[PDB]
Structures are given as structure tokens and as C-alpha cells.
Amino acid sequence: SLWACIAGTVLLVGLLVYLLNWLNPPRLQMGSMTSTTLYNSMWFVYGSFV
Amino acid sequence: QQGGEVPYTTLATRMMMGAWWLFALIVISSYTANLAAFLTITRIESSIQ
């Protein structure tokens, strides 16, 4: 069970970040993929996790 | 682990890399764990007394 809990927490935190890009994004580099898709909002949170 | 982020942009490669890394980290942790076992089993036993 703990394996699944860990795996789910990744995408939980990823979406919890994604809410920030929806509602309080910074002065991002214009047109840059720092205006993350869902994909990048996974990719950062997984890449930092390994 | 030295390489850092990989610049590719294609789904099939990133989807492979996501498993590749989770192979590497497991194997590294297995190595350190077994070496610690080996070292703690060592340095105890002898009996010619």
C-alpha cells in the first residue's frame, strides 16, 4: 500500500502546484513552458523525486 | 546521477527515462545496503583459542 500512496502523492503535489500556475503565476518568461502544461507539472515533481 | 536533467522532449524517451532512473536508484540503494550487511557480519567471529 505504501508504494501506491507514494506514487499518488507525486501527482497530488503536482496538481497542488498546478493550482498556483492557475491562480498566482509570477512574471514568467513570456511564452516559456514555465507556464507549465500538466506534463511539465509532473516532470519537475518526479525529476526532483529521483 | 552526475548527468542531471536530459534535454530530450519526446514522450517515448521521457517515459523510458522515468523507469530507468527508478532502476538506478534501487540498484545503488541495494549496493549500499548489502555492503553494510557484509561489513557488519564481518569483524566478529573466530574460535581457535
Swiss-Prot record, chain A:
Belongs to the glutamate-gated ion channel (TC 1.A.10.1) family. GRID2 subfamily. The gene is GRID2. Tetramer; dimer of dimers. Interacts with EML2, MAGI2 (via PDZ domains) and AP4M1. Interacts with BECN1, GOPC, GRID2IP, SHANK1 and SHANK2. Interacts with CBLN2, but not with CBLN4. Interacts with CBLN1 (via C1q domain); the interaction is CBLN1-NRX1 complex formation-dependent; CBLN1-binding is calcium-independent; CBLN1 hexamers anchor GRID2 N-terminal domain dimers to monomeric NRXN1 isoform beta; promotes synaptogenesis and mediates the D-Serine-dependent long term depression signals and AMPA receptor endocytosis. The chain crosses the membrane at residues 1-20. Member of the ionotropic glutamate receptor family, which plays a crucial role in synaptic organization and signal transduction in the central nervous system. Although it shares structural features with ionotropic glutamate receptors, does not bind glutamate as a primary ligand. Promotes synaptogenesis and mediates the D-Serine-dependent long term depression signals and AMPA receptor endocytosis of cerebellar parallel fiber-Purkinje cell (PF-PC) synapses through the NRX1B-CBLN1-GRID2 triad complex. Residues 21-50 are cytoplasmic. This is Glutamate receptor ionotropic, delta-2. The chain holds residues 568 to 617 of 1007 of the full protein. It comes from the Eukaryota. It is linked to Spinocerebellar ataxia, autosomal recessive, 18: A form of spinocerebellar ataxia, a clinically and genetically heterogeneous group of cerebellar disorders. Patients show progressive incoordination of gait and often poor coordination of hands, speech and eye movements, due to degeneration of the cerebellum with variable involvement of the brainstem and spinal cord. SCAR18 features include progressive cerebellar atrophy, delayed psychomotor development, severely impaired gait, ocular movement abnormalities, and intellectual disability. It is found in: Postsynaptic cell membrane. The PDZ-binding motif mediates interaction with GOPC.
